[PDB]
Design a protein around this ligand. Structure first.
Ligand SMILES: [N+]
Ligand SMILES: [N+]
Ligand SMILES: [N+]
Length: 296
């Protein structure tokens, strides 16, 4: 039993946050979806009778949850799942650190990687992953409750990806699954660039709708994201964050919030401090406001 800690699997992550008080939107939406109980049984994302035929026992659309109704909340298709940014060493490899709360005999440690062009918003299916694993570990030694394996990192990848780790025990027929959300650096520097400030002059009436349009370098419609503000989200120090959360969730092309040293953009409960970032130049954005229809 266990999962990856370096990098953190999607389940280890949500849990290091604090199941009883999630911090990231994805994790909040995960506990609201499948309960807090799954986040504690974080070691049992498994299939007792895989026998090496994971493709026949893990249903499409529930890979992150091994089709276990308990972990239903892990299969959410979102663009904001917290993710580790990874890169190779001087030789192109990556040292994975798997945490085994119960060291059992090992058959293999297979690493799958989403195809080029993976779309976070489509629930992870087997065919969204590349056909054969990019790294196959066949013997390990324990070291302070973790299995450490050097792996050749796939080259040419770019953007947010999911590494799918399968651990097939040798002593029994069961295996464990780990959706690791990673993020690759392209062949060209892709630093988040700020475009404007998602500023709020005064509060908006409850039920009004707030729309953010994004235009590319050629003034073409790039993306659109709308959000009707329920009571309590219409505050001036509230709605800019409410919109910045709907944006980050549905999109990886534009992110609204605060940039940190690592390179991540997380919003804030601020009236002015929320910023609109895009990984290309010359982009522009507009904020439109539909007011609640009046009349009988
Ligand atoms: N077990
Ligand atoms: N691919
Ligand atoms: N959504």
């Amino acid at each position: 039993h266990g999962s990856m800690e370096t990098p953190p699997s999607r389940v280890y992550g949500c849990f290091l946050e604090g199941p009883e008080n999630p911090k990231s939107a994805a994790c909040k939406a995960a506990v609201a979806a499948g309960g807090t109980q799954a986040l504690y049984d974080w070691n049992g994302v498994n299939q007792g009778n895989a026998n090496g035929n994971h493709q026949a026992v893990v249903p499409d659309g529930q890979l992150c949850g091994a089709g276990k109704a308990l972990f239903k909340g892990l299969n959410l298709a979102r663009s904001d799942w917290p993710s580790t940014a990874i890169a190779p060493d001087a030789s192109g490899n990556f040292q994975f650190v798997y945490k085994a709360s119960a060291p059992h005999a090992t058959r293999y440690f297979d690493f799958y990687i989403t195809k080029d062009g993976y779309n976070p918003e489509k629930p992870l299916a087997w065919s969204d992953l590349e056909p054969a694993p990019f790294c196959s570990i066949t013997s390990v030694k324990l070291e302070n409750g973790t299995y450490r394996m050097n792996c050749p990192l796939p080259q040419g990848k770019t953007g947010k990806h999911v590494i799918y780790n399968v651990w097939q025990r040798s002593d029994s027929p069961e295996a464990f699954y780990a959706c690791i959300d990673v993020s690759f650096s392209g062949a060209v520097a892709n630093p988040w660039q700020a475009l404007g400030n998602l500023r709020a002059q005064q509060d908006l009436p409850a039920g009004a709708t707030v729309t953010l349009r994004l235009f590319d370098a050629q003034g073409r419609d790039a993306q659109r994201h709308s959000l009707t503000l329920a009571q309590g989200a219409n505050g001036a120090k509230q709605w800019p964050l409410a919109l910045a959360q709907k944006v980050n969730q549905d999109s990886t092309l534009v992110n609204i919030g605060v940039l940190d040293a690592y390179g991540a953009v997380s919003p804030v409960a601020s009236s002015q401090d929320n910023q609109v970032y895009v990984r290309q130049a010359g982009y522009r954005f507009q904020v439109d406001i539909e007011l609640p229809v009046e009349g009988g």
